[PDB]
């Protein structure tokens, strides 16, 4: 089921068997790379970049056409962000809830949900410190 919820939701992406590039795809590996770079400069997230490239330009899977993933391409050049996507998003959700809580002292629900977010930050931070993508002195405030 979920991390911090009783729901057993089964809703994710089902990537097809055929890894083969579609015959109708005109864009080449280098052309896609140039597109990813141009998108990345506008200040976007690998998630958003992948969605925009899937919707607009008709690239089913970047890793199939190029042979490398979005964060990996941006890492290889050096247009990758300092904090990983998911940790950054948890921190901005945490500070948003804390900003709400600072006015509302009675909102017990907000306090409970903050505790649940903080737990996700710490559990993800520990993993990133284990893989040595963050420094070992990295704390949360």
């Amino acid at each position: 089921g979920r991390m911090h919820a009783p729901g057993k939701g089964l809703s994710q992406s089902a990537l097809p068997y055929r890894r083969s590039v579609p015959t109708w795809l005109k864009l080449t590996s280098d052309d896609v790379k140039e597109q990813i770079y141009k998108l990345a400069k506008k200040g976007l997230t690998p998630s958003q970049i992948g969605v925009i490239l899937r919707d607009s330009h008709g690239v089913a899977q970047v890793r199939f056409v190029t042979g490398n993933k979005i964060l990996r391409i941006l890492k290889s050049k050096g247009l990758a962000p300092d904090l990983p996507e998911d940790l950054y998003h948890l921190i901005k959700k945490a500070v948003a809830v804390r900003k709400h809580l600072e006015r509302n002292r009675k909102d017990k629900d907000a306090k409970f949900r903050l505790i649940l977010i903080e737990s996700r930050i710490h559990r993800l931070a520990r993993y990133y410190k284990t893989k040595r993508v963050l420094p070992p002195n990295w704390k949360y405030e």
């Binding site: 994710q12 089902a14 990537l15 579609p22 109708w24 969605v51 607009s56």
Partner: protein, 82 residues
Amino acid sequence: PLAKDLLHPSPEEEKRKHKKKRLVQSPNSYFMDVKCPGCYKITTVFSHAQTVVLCVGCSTVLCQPTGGKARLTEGCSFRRKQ
């Protein structure tokens, strides 16, 4: 019950059954090409799409983001690719 070929299910039963609980996984989504009424240039869009997409040819909205599949604008004709 008791005799079904789990190996070779009938293709209509295969399509009905959930995308993740199929014998071999395949997405229900597809890639389709759009022909805008006030333009000559062709564009490709994802069946369940999430961003309002723009045709830079005439600078007009094509498909709308919805709960499921993206609703195309009136006049713009969609056709299945492979």
